[PDB]
Design a protein around this ligand. Structure first.
Ligand SMILES: *[C@@H](O)[C@H](C[C@@H]1CCNC1=O)NC(=O)[C@H](CC(C)C)NC(=O)OCc1ccc(F)cc1
Ligand SMILES: *[C@@H](O)[C@H](C[C@@H]1CCNC1=O)NC(=O)[C@H](CC(C)C)NC(=O)OCc1ccc(F)cc1
Lengths: 297, 297
């Protein structure tokens, strides 16, 4: 079962930010509200916004920040890459211990999808190798954030900005830098060709075994390089030695050498599933990291 | 995707309840804490407990209830079916608006997996027609709850008690009444063979049509009885009147009557997919209710 972090610590930071007729979500940490800068845009701006030029023309009072049944007065604004930082005259008492991090492709995080500053749902995602993410984001979800929770500390890693024509999504870290070659203008943008996160597919196979499902296994083996040759043929990420090291615990917990599971996965890529399923799924799932699998088993 | 409700309102209600060394989770709403009654069981008592005799031997001061490290003094106790209701001397200030609801098989709900009273994860579950759930629960998870949020109000519908031989899970509503034919004894128990959740498969087909995928729509229709008798032959559930009703909005949204979609589904069962996909899948998904379909559209 694909599992997200309890979202309560993030829910208490979500506020509604409005500029003109655009409304989206902001993240209220301490006395700063973070949100996507394209909130300041209009139609005649969306296509080629000179954001520095549009921002200087804005006043503290053009920003209506509403937290619940209360407006927060903006007493300053600044821009950092594609995120807009609005200073407010109040501090969020519910601010949790947090940090801002930029995650790598193949890493996973939970997403608190929000509309008009109100949480609506949470789910688990991975940073695809092509720096998109496959989310469930509708109009008004912008400003929703992705995060991980280690101990009592919230590592924010993503803020939502756009949906690509293919239906995947693009966004920035909380420093405002996009993941991938995307731009916050209203233009149709294609991504690089995506690939499957092999070390996550292997972690997930190990999980199906831990849960008493071993039909995909086989008595064969493979070298790492020979496996990566096949893996890349099928547009699967290469497996590094660190990837093998990271899989050690699952290899141990199950007595299935990593390279043996690579042989299994190799057979699956060349043969298919031929009706059969793993952990309910007819597709090879690649949004469970080894760490995700371990914590849950 | 499976998308959970935001969990913060339920996180604010989780505590831990300890008898001797037996610790599970409980649910703190106003001045009452709800938990599974087998907290009063020693490991050996669980093989075939006498709950009434085990309860008579108990007093308020045998019950350690902690929010975090903070003790809530128990001032009274009673047993309602398979759950324990502990009166505590502090009303929970984080109490949401809430109700206790008993869901039907097929309905979905989010589960907040907790251990020692601390949330670890939130995920979406479906109550199978055999009254199990395919959850992700470990030792110490008992007392974790399942809920839906309707506007401001948290509807609590599940409390976790046990894992069955087959690896699925079982539990009660918040009045302590088990879902399905199970009991809180550490004895061998078996869930009836599972079936496919027809209403949810139908919701899924509606979802495929809303997205333009509609090849499978046919020109025929059927009666509810005819469809029910046929669907059982493929180990699909029969439709109830309530199932027809909650498909109403999707029927209205698409203009496709429920019994027309039943005929289209009947055709898929009898003739198969012919290798075709629906929403990018040859398998028919049955863990998305008509509500979830809307929430994501
Ligand atoms: C939040 O404001 C919103 C979220 C989008 C809307 C629907 N689903 C989402 O994930 N973001 C946008 O509307 C975004 C803003 C621009 C200025 C960065 N544009 C967008 O999502 O559509 C991109 C697009 C542009 C042109 C085109 F032809 C096709 C798609
Ligand atoms: C909560 O106390 C616990 C949850 C179980 C433990 C493993 N996974 C779960 O979901 N419940 C019980 O231990 C329960 C108590 C009796 C009174 C009903 N017994 C139980 O679930 O037995 C089956 C079991 C299977 C595997 C396992 F590792 C432990 C127990």
């Amino acid at each position: 079962r694909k599992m997200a972090f309890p979202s309560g610590k993030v829910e208490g930071c979500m506020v509604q930010v409005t500029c003109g007729t655009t409304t989206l979500n902001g993240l209220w940490l301490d006395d700063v509200v973070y949100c996507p800068r394209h909130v300041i845009c209009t139609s005649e701006d969306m296509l080629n916004p000179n954001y520095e030029d549009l921002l200087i023309r804005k006043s503290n009072h053009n920003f209506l920040v509403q937290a619940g049944n209360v407006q927060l007065r903006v007493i300053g604004h600044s821009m950092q890459n594609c995120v807009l930082k609005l200073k407010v005259d109040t501090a969020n008492p519910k601010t949790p211990k947090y940090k801002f991090v930029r995650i790598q492709p193949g890493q996973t995080f939970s997403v608190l999808a929000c509309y008009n500053g109100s949480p609506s749902g949470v789910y688990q995602c991975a940073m695809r190798p092509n720096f998109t993410i496959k989310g469930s984001f509708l109009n008004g979800s912008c400003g929703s954030v992705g995060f991980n929770i280690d101990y009592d500390c919230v590592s924010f890693c993503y803020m939502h900005h756009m949906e690509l024509p293919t239906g995947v999504h693009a966004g920035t870290d909380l420093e405002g830098n996009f993941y991938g070659p995307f731009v916050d203008r209203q233009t149709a943008q294609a991504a690089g060709t995506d690939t499957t996160i092999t070390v996550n597919v292997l972690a997930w196979l190990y999980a199906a075994v831990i849960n008493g499902d071993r039909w995909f296994l086989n008595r064969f083996t493979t070298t790492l390089n020979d496996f990566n040759l096949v893996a890349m043929k099928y547009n699967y990420e290469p497996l590094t030695q660190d990837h093998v090291d990271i899989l050690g615990p699952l290899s141990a917990q199950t007595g299935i050498a990593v390279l043996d599971m690579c042989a299994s996965l190799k057979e699956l890529l060349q043969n298919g599933m031929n009706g059969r399923t793993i952990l309910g799924s007819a597709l090879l799932e690649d949004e469970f990291t080894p760490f995700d699998v371990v914590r849950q088993c």
